[PDB]
């Protein structure tokens, strides 16, 4: 149906510029205002501005005037937002959301765009299999894990066997220290399919465009 | 401009209880308030528009009320998947502003933390590092003590506690206590032990393993 | 012998309500409330009065005093003051023409609405008409509606595709042809001014009894009506909320000065003509004072008349009245206000008195507008003219119809803006400056204080003296410089005017101005002597 597919995460050095796209689909693109909402880590939603796709009618917020520049293209039904003078405060998630003209609600949003403004080098993650020992008592279920150590920025994805299954996967948030992140993942799966079948965790780092897959071994 | 104030940053409720989040605006708004539901890790989802009207695709358990400045979002039958952070937003005056955000935490019965200790893998011992892990899964509430024991002594340097958010299925928190050490220090000690003190029981749960090729 | 002394007015109240009739128009109704609520709200009253006291009032009273004292036209009075500036009298004659091309077409719209408002079900209520598109979405229809960028309201559809038919023109480039309905409307207008001007000051002065008093009645009905509407305090809040920070902007003062000037309209020759037909013994200080204070307060209450209905309209919709009051111009009254009064009981009544009120507002002002020019030409070419008044009056009226034929087109509205912004404002400001400077500096403000001292019996205060010598020509100079420095890009109905419009505008702004430096060249070029000799005999008026 109505889909707003935004662009991927961006790691940009402070002081530079960055442009974010927003592919709209599933409705008459010229029939709705295209908005941009900023969401800082742990903060509330912040309205950047809107744009009329017909003529590029940008209506900004006084707080973002000269900070963001909204553009639009009808030939591909895609709205863009460009940001200059990047600081540490701009390291936030940005959404592009559709809205009618009245009443002005935000019915459909995008998945978000993680922006990290830091001069820290893109560090690839170290994937180390967190496997149970060989002396443990195998009960009705075994808990497994995979450790992701030392990466930047927070763009990372830990999957388990192409997403099948994952009805008991506990993913622990990443922690930042000395400019590098570190997280861990776990999965509770019964003992009647291990170690008979194959269980493998896949760690993907989009900012460094790397993907290391490690299989758990007791 | 308009200042939307949500005085209560957190609200505790249970599955099936009647919950209601408040929203205070700067001036008179008539009936121009929209309520959004942002689930952890998802985009904000529109639920209510113009104070009381529900948006399409929203279950009957979500309602809205208020007329003037103060507005209220009501859920009659809270489900495990209704766990989210709710925002209120005005839609009359330029610019459009939002509320501070009210996280709805679900209250349930106590649960015993399942503690599992993990020895450093061979790929990490190969790299020259060794991290002993201690997972604490499915417990309630969030308040829980985690104590480390390298060889019986409470280890405190290099310990990181990571609490996940509440669950959307059984409403059970889960945390990870990580004890990261070097390889040289790992091959000079054997049986690692991590214990957890929770309110479910007075005696902390003690877990141990051996370094000598398990 | 023969004519000799000029005629005299029929009563004091006729000329009081007559100059009030010129002063009060459409802009008083909607322009001032918009510019007021936009520039700092109620705080706008603080500079507006200053720009009144220091700027509008002195020009108003000076013009009026000269008019009643010298009893001459807009062209013949310069013969007896500063002959080289006689071209001023000509310039106004051109300026007025440009104004009469669009000012009455607006009254034609209000007239087309008025005759279209006699039906039991008003046309701009339903969408099942012969002019509505598929975008037309209206009320008394399913609730929950969520408006679309392409959707359009039945009032906007009616004003756009019917009375204007502006969708049938692409802009200034292609605007033809002519809408005969508005041609018949404006023809009826030129008729109703024809039977109110053709005889002279007696008929204009008698029609003014109705054309200047009824707007207060219609504004009173819509005032007490708009006040009883639920949630009307929003428009009043947005209308009078003080935002003193906007007063720090150097623009706002400029807006206030331009507003009070173009709402008192001094130095246009209309006040000269209206003042000419009065008693020499008759006081005029109180006249000018009260008349202005009426135009200003009338604007102040008109603000409520508009923003109460706009407040109710913002309550039925969703607040922040500014959004429902974004567009200033013909759309604030013909669309928003009409659509607002459509949802009220006995809507035929409020509609009839509303658009009838619009025509009633324009009528008196255009009476006076023509009155000044007619007096000027009759006094400048006597005996060669005055053979009949209906001849010259008929000529100028049919001339105004042919002038409005460019405005009766589909894109006529476009032209209306081009003529409303570019042509009148800079030139009128200029001629007011040159006129004020010529009366205060050339003729000498001392001899002017002697003329008023012979007029009312007492010399005008040192306040009026310093206002005429310095404060008023600086008041006009301010708006002149600020205007020339930042001419405005203008847009109407989702259509930005071409970059070249200003060029066209400047033509229409200067094609009327060319007469005064060329007349100075004609005077100084026609009488031989030296440059210092001929300009000294050309700056001093007739001795006898
Ligand atoms: Br800029 C400028 C300067 C002064 C004015 C006055 C002042 C306010 N009250 C009416 C208005 C009179 O506007 C006219 C209308 C029809 C006319 C006319 C003049 O002369 C020929 O027919 C408007 C614009
Ligand atoms: C409605 O208006 C849009 C432009 O505003 C136009 O493209 C569309 O064709 C219109 N609808 C109909 C049915 O004409």
């Amino acid at each position: 149906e109505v889909q707003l597919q935004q662009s991927g995460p961006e790691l940009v050095k402070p002081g530079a510029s960055v442009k974010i796209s927003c592919k709209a689909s599933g409705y008459t693109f010229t029939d709705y205002y295209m908005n941009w909402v900023k969401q800082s880590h742990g903060k509330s939603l912040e309205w950047i501005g809107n744009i009329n796709p017909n003529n590029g009618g940008t209506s900004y917020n006084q707080k973002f005037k000269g900070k963001a520049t909204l553009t639009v293209d009808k030939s591909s039904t895609t709205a863009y937002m460009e940001l200059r003078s990047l600081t540490s405060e701009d390291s936030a998630v940005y959404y592009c959301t559709r809205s009618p003209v009245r009443p002005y609600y935000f019915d459909y949003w995008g998945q978000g765009t993680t922006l990290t403004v830091s001069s820290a080098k893109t560090t690839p993650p170290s994937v180390y299999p967190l496997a149970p020992g060989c002396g443990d008592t195998t009960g009705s279920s075994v808990t497994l894990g995979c450790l992701v150590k030392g990466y930047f920025p927070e763009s990372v994805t830990v999957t388990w066997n192409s997403g099948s299954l994952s009805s008991s996967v506990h993913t622990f948030p990443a922690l930042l220290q000395s400019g590098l992140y570190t997280m861990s993942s776990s999965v509770t799966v019964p003992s009647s399919t291990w170690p008979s079948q194959t269980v493998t965790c896949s760690v993907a780092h989009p900012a460094s465009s790397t993907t290391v897959d490690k299989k758990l071994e007791p | 401009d308009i200042v939307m104030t949500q005085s209560h940053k957190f609200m505790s409720t249970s599955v099936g209880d009647r919950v209601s989040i408040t929203c205070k605006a700067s001036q008179d708004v008539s009936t121009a308030v929209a309520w959004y539901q942002q689930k952890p890790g998802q985009s904000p989802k529109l639920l209510i528009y113009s104070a009381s009207y529900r948006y399409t695709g929203v279950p009957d358990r979500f309602t809205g009320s208020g007329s003037g400045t103060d507005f209220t979002f009501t859920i009659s039958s809270v489900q495990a998947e209704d766990l989210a952070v709710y925002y209120c937003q005005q839609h009359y005056s330029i610019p459009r502003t939002f509320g501070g955000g009210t996280k709805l935490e679900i209250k349930r019965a106590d649960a015993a933390p399942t503690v599992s200790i993990f020895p450093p893998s061979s790929e990490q011992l190969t790299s020259g590092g060794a991290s002993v892990v201690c997972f604490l899964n499915n417990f309630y509430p969030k308040d829980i003590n985690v104590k480390w024991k390298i060889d019986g002594s409470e280890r405190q340097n290099g310990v990181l506690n990571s609490w996940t958010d509440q669950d959307s299925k059984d409403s059970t928190y889960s945390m990870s206590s990580t004890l990261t050490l070097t390889k040289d220090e790992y091959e000079r000690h054997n049986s690692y032990t991590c214990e957890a003190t929770h309110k479910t029981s007075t005696s902390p749960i003690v877990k141990s393993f051996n370094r000598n090729e398990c | 012998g023969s004519q000799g002394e000029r005629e005299t007015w029929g009563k004091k109240v006729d000329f009081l309500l007559s100059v009030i009739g010129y002063a009060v128009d459409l802009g008083n109704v909607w322009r001032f409330p918009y510019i007021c609520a936009q520039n700092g709200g109620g705080a706008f009253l603080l500079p507006y009065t200053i720009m009144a006291i220091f700027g509008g009032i002195p020009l108003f009273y000076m013009e009026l005093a000269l008019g009643q004292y010298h009893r001459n036209g807009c062209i013949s009075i310069w013969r007896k003051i500063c002959p080289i500036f006689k071209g001023i009298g000509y310039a106004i004659c051109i300026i007025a023409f440009y104004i009469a091309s669009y000012y009455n077409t607006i009254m034609a719209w209000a007239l087309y609405y008025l005759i279209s408002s006699f039906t039991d079900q008003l046309p701009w209520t339903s969408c099942k008409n012969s002019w509505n598109t598929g975008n037309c979405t209206n009320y008394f229809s399913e609730d929950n509606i969520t408006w679309t960028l392409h959707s359009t309201s039945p009032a906007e559809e009616f004003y756009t595709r019917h009375v204007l038919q502006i969708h049938r023109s692409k802009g200034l480039q292609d605007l033809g042809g002519i809408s005969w309905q508005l041609a018949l409307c404006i023809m009826l207008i030129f008729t109703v001014i024809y039977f109110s001007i053709w005889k002279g000051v007696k008929t204009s002065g008698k029609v003014v009894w109705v054309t200047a008093t009824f707007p207060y009645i219609a504004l009173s009905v819509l005032l007490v009506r708009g006040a009883t509407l639920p949630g009307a305090w929003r428009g009043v809040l947005f209308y009078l909320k003080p935002n003193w920070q906007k007063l720090l902007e150097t623009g706002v003062w400029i807006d206030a000065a331009a507003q009070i000037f173009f709402s008192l309209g001094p130095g246009f020759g209309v006040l000269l003509a209206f003042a000419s037909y009065n008693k020499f013994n008759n006081n005029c200080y109180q006249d000018a004072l009260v008349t202005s204070v009426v135009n200003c307060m009338t604007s102040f209450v008109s603000g409520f008349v508009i923003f109460t209905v706009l407040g109710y309209m913002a309550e039925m919709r969703n607040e922040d009245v500014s959004e429902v009051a974004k567009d200033a111009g013909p759309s604030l009254l013909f669309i928003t206000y009409a659509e607002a009064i459509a949802n009220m009981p006995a809507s035929t009544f409020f509609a009839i008195i509303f658009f009838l009120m619009l025509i009633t507002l324009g009528l008196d002002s255009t009476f006076a507008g023509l009155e000044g020019v007619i007096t000027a030409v009759l006094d400048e070419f006597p005996h060669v003219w005055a053979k009949r008044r209906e001849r010259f009056v008929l000529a100028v009226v049919i001339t105004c119809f042919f002038g409005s034929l460019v405005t009766l087109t589909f894109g006529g509205a476009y032209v209306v803006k081009l003529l409303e912004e570019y042509a009148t404002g800079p030139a009128v400001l200029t001629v007011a400056l040159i006129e004020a400077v010529a009366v205060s500096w050339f003729y000498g403000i001392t001899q002017f204080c002697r003329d008023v001292k012979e007029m009312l019996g007492f010399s005008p205060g040192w306040f009026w003296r310093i206002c005429w010598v310095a404060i008023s020509p600086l008041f006009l100079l301010f708006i002149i410089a600020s205007f020339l420095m930042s001419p405005p890009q203008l847009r109407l109905f989702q259509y930005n005017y071409p970059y070249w419009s200003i060029i066209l505008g400047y033509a229409i702004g200067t094609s009327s101005f060319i007469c005064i430096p060329t007349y100075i060249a004609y005077r100084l070029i026609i009488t031989p002597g030296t440059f210092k000799e001929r300009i000294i005999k050309s700056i001093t008026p007739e001795t006898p």
Side-chain angles (χ1 to χ4, degrees), chain A residues 2-218, chain B residues 1-211 213-214, chain C residues 1-2 4-71 73-127 129-201 203-389 392-533 535-544:
Chain A
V2 179
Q3 297 191 27
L4 305 185
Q5 182 69 19
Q6 319 192 195
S7 56
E10 295 289 340
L11 171 58
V12 286
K13 288 188 175 183
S17 303
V18 59
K19 183 184 301 179
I20 300 179
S21 65
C22 183
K23 174 63 180 181
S25 54
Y27 71 99
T28 306
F29 182 76
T30 65
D31 271 345
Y32 292 96
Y33 268 142
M34 183 59 60
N35 306 260
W36 288 85
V37 184
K38 171 185 175 182
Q39 187 186 204
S40 302
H41 182 65
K43 296 299 179 181
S44 181
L45 300 174
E46 206 168 19
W47 184 71
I48 298 177
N50 65 268
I51 180 171
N52 192 337
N54 298 8
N55 61 330
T58 62
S59 175
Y60 300 107
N61 189 344
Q62 185 181 1
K63 193 179 184 181
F64 295 92
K65 282 181 181 180
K67 183 57 183 180
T69 297
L70 306 185
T71 49
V72 69
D73 178 32
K74 298 174 297 181
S75 299
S76 59
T77 69
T78 306
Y80 303 88
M81 177 183 64
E82 187 175 358
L83 302 174
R84 80 173 191 265
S85 301
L86 296 166
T87 62
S88 60
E89 295 292 337
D90 299 329
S91 304
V93 184
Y94 293 91
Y95 295 93
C96 56
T97 177
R98 188 191 84 169
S99 67
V101 292
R102 174 161 54 256
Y104 210 90
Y105 53 74
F106 300 141
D107 43 23
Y108 295 95
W109 297 61
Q111 81 280 5
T113 300
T114 299
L115 177 63
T116 303
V117 183
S118 179
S119 302
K121 181 59 182 178
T122 308
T123 304
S126 299
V127 187
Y128 298 141
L130 300 181
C134 61
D136 301 30
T137 299
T138 299
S140 60
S141 61
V142 186
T143 302
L144 325 176
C146 282
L147 175 64
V148 180
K149 175 252 181 179
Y151 65 101
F152 187 87
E154 61 180 5
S155 298
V156 70
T157 298
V158 178
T159 62
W160 292 86
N161 301 329
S162 181
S164 61
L165 57 88
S166 57
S167 60
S168 59
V169 174
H170 302 263
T171 299
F172 305 96
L175 298 181
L176 181 58
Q177 50 182 0
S178 68
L180 297 181
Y181 291 96
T182 295
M183 61 88 60
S184 57
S185 180
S186 64
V187 62
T188 303
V189 287
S191 307
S192 299
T193 178
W194 186 88
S196 59
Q197 296 186 5
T198 299
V199 178
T200 301
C201 69
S202 178
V203 179
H205 198 271
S208 61
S209 299
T210 60
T211 300
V212 179
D213 309 332
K214 292 298 179 178
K215 179 179 178 178
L216 209 78
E217 299 295 334
Chain B
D1 290 22
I2 309 303
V3 180
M4 302 302 286
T5 302
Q6 306 188 40
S7 57
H8 301 278
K9 308 298 296 183
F10 299 91
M11 283 195 59
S12 303
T13 190
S14 303
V15 177
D17 292 32
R18 182 187 184 95
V19 68
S20 297
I21 305 181
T22 61
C23 183
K24 178 177 298 181
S26 71
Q27 62 183 15
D28 187 276
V29 181
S30 172
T31 62
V33 174
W35 294 90
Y36 297 80
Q37 173 201 21
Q38 189 180 198
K39 298 180 181 178
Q42 297 182 3
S43 59
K45 178 183 179 181
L46 177 68
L47 292 193
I48 303 300
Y49 74 100
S50 297
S52 63
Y53 294 93
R54 310 183 189 94
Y55 194 75
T56 59
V58 178
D60 302 270
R61 61 179 182 267
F62 302 96
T63 56
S65 60
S67 180
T69 57
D70 302 331
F71 295 85
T72 304
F73 179 76
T74 307
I75 306 178
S76 60
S77 178
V78 181
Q79 299 180 359
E81 57 180 351
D82 284 332
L83 173 77
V85 183
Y86 294 86
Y87 295 84
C88 59
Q89 170 252 61
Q90 57 97 348
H91 62 76
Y92 65 104
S93 181
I94 297 180
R96 289 78 167 81
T97 56
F98 291 81
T102 299
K103 182 178 180 181
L104 190 64
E105 47 188 359
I106 303 180
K107 181 65 180 300
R108 60 153 293 177
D110 301 329
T114 302
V115 178
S116 301
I117 191 169
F118 292 84
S121 59
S122 58
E123 298 187 7
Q124 185 177 2
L125 292 178
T126 304
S127 300
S131 301
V132 178
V133 187
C134 195
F135 285 155
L136 297 81
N137 308 331
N138 308 94
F139 62 92
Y140 192 85
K142 178 183 179 180
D143 294 339
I144 181 176
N145 179 267
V146 177
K147 188 172 299 181
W148 277 92
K149 294 177 181 179
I150 295 184
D151 283 323
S153 176
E154 177 183 354
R155 185 55 179 179
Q156 203 75 15
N157 287 10
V159 177
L160 289 183
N161 294 328
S162 180
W163 289 287
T164 65
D165 292 328
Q166 202 171 15
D167 198 272
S168 63
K169 304 171 275 71
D170 58 338
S171 301
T172 56
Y173 292 89
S174 298
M175 67 164 301
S176 67
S177 181
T178 303
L179 181 62
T180 301
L181 292 177
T182 63
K183 179 177 57 182
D184 301 330
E185 189 175 4
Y186 172 72
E187 290 192 0
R188 286 191 293 265
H189 300 276
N190 184 24
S191 62
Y192 286 97
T193 295
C194 64
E195 64 177 6
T197 302
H198 200 267
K199 70 172 300 300
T200 47
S201 181
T202 61
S203 299
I205 300 181
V206 172
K207 287 300 180 299
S208 306
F209 74 89
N210 299 331
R211 186 196 60 87
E213 211 66 29
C214 44
Chain C
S2 69
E5 55 185 3
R6 154 194 233 78
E7 281 289 317
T8 181
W9 217 308
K11 198 179 182 179
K12 186 59 168 168
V13 189
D14 292 336
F15 176 17
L16 191 59
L17 267 59
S18 192
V19 65
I20 285 181
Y22 162 76
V24 168
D25 65 9
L26 297 174
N28 273 90
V29 192
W30 66 265
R31 193 78 171 185
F32 175 77
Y34 176 83
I35 193 58
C36 180
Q38 261 295 121
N39 294 17
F44 185 77
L45 292 176
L46 187 141
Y48 173 80
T49 52
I50 294 175
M51 290 307 183
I53 298 179
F54 289 164
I57 319 299
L59 298 168
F60 194 76
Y61 168 67
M62 186 187 65
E63 164 96 321
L64 199 63
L66 292 164
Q68 193 183 50
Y69 177 77
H70 287 73
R71 310 208 320 265
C74 312
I75 314 174
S76 56
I77 195 179
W78 288 106
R79 174 187 289 182
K80 63 181 61 180
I81 296 301
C82 299
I84 50 176
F85 297 147
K86 195 177 186 177
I88 278 182
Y90 279 168
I92 294 178
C93 287
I94 298 185
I95 289 296
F97 167 74
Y98 282 144
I99 301 184
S101 297
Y102 70 93
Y103 196 90
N104 298 280
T105 59
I106 297 177
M107 304 177 51
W109 299 337
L111 182 54
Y112 194 78
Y113 272 97
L114 181 69
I115 62 181
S116 293
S117 184
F118 286 150
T119 315
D120 58 328
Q121 285 295 91
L122 312 90
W124 61 87
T125 299
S126 299
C127 279
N129 303 271
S130 60
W131 52 85
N132 296 132
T133 41
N135 285 287
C136 194
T137 72
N138 63 347
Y139 279 73
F140 196 70
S141 164
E142 145 196 73
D143 189 10
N144 115 291
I145 60 171
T146 66
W147 206 273
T148 301
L149 281 171
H150 299 175
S151 288
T152 316
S153 70
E156 186 182 4
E157 286 269 330
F158 180 75
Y159 182 69
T160 294
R161 322 278 314 296
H162 203 206
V163 58
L164 261 57
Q165 203 168 182
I166 195 172
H167 66 275
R168 206 151 174 170
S169 65
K170 297 185 297 181
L172 295 174
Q173 305 86 354
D174 181 85
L175 40 81
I178 301 182
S179 300
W180 48 269
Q181 294 85 0
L182 293 312
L184 267 57
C185 292
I186 195 182
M187 235 163 186
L188 179 59
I189 293 171
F190 286 145
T191 304
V192 75
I193 71 181
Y194 186 24
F195 291 160
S196 303
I197 286 299
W198 68 328
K199 187 172 182 178
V201 300
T203 48
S204 69
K206 261 60 181 180
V207 183
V208 156
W209 269 93
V210 183
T211 68
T213 50
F214 174 74
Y216 291 81
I217 299 179
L219 284 177
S220 182
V221 178
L222 294 176
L223 182 65
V224 175
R225 169 68 275 179
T228 52
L229 292 176
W233 58 270
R234 303 186 186 274
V236 185
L237 176 64
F238 176 77
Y239 170 61
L240 287 183
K241 181 181 178 181
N243 192 332
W244 303 98
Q245 292 184 354
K246 287 294 300 177
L247 199 61
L248 288 180
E249 312 296 331
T250 179
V252 296
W253 287 84
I254 297 190
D255 296 39
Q259 171 61 30
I260 185 63
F261 171 80
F262 286 108
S263 178
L264 282 182
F268 188 73
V270 161
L271 311 165
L272 190 77
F274 269 180
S276 178
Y277 303 98
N278 214 22
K279 186 172 65 178
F280 185 89
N281 201 350
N282 175 245
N283 176 30
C284 58
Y285 176 82
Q286 187 187 239
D287 283 39
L289 191 144
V290 75
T291 299
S292 297
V293 176
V294 194
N295 174 101
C296 312
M297 294 300 293
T298 305
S299 301
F300 188 63
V301 299
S302 297
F304 295 100
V305 179
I306 298 297
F307 272 87
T308 46
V309 184
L310 251 60
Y312 153 78
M313 198 61 176
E315 178 69 18
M316 261 191 169
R317 286 160 58 157
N318 266 333
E319 220 202 332
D320 191 73
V321 194
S322 151
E323 312 322 334
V324 77
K326 284 182 175 178
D327 51 335
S331 302
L332 189 146
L333 299 180
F334 286 142
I335 302 184
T336 297
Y337 208 91
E339 183 175 307
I341 63 182
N343 295 118
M344 304 197 307
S347 40
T348 298
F349 175 77
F350 297 99
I352 286 182
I353 69 176
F354 172 70
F355 297 107
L356 187 63
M357 175 197 65
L358 298 178
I359 307 168
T360 316
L361 285 162
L363 269 179
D364 36 332
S365 293
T366 191
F367 293 162
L370 293 181
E371 179 67 34
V373 177
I374 297 166
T375 299
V377 181
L378 285 184
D379 288 28
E380 177 54 37
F381 287 43
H383 184 214
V384 175
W385 271 102
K387 55 220 243 202
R388 238 296 200 41
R389 187 164 177 167
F392 180 70
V393 169
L394 186 148
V396 63
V397 160
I398 192 178
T399 303
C400 290
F401 187 80
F402 280 88
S404 295
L405 288 181
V406 185
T407 318
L408 291 169
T409 50
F410 302 140
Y414 294 143
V415 183
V416 182
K417 200 71 190 175
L418 182 82
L419 268 48
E420 191 172 1
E421 234 60 23
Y422 280 142
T424 78
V428 174
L429 276 191
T430 307
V431 66
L433 176 63
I434 300 179
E435 176 175 347
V437 169
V439 176
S440 182
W441 293 6
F442 271 84
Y443 178 76
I445 200 56
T446 62
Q447 190 59 224
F448 180 77
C449 293
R450 195 262 185 174
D451 294 330
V452 179
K453 186 164 57 183
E454 183 58 38
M455 201 60 165
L456 278 66
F458 59 92
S459 181
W462 49 265
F463 179 83
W464 302 111
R465 197 189 73 89
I466 189 182
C467 276
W468 296 327
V469 171
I471 310 183
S472 304
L474 291 174
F475 169 81
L476 295 177
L477 207 68
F478 197 11
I479 323 176
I480 282 287
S482 64
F483 271 38
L484 295 174
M485 275 312 188
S486 292
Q489 195 145 359
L490 26 45
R491 186 185 61 92
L492 182 74
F493 284 149
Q494 317 298 330
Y495 161 72
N496 292 273
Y497 286 59
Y499 61 95
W500 56 258
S501 58
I502 177 179
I503 311 172
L504 170 51
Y506 260 85
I508 319 177
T510 54
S511 62
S512 57
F513 180 80
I514 54 172
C515 58
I516 177 181
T518 52
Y519 183 85
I520 290 182
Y522 198 84
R523 197 83 180 189
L524 172 158
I525 252 67
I526 200 75
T527 64
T530 313
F531 148 60
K532 228 284 198 309
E533 172 101 347
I535 72 106
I536 274 298
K537 174 78 176 174
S538 290
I539 62 112
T540 47
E542 295 302 320
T543 297

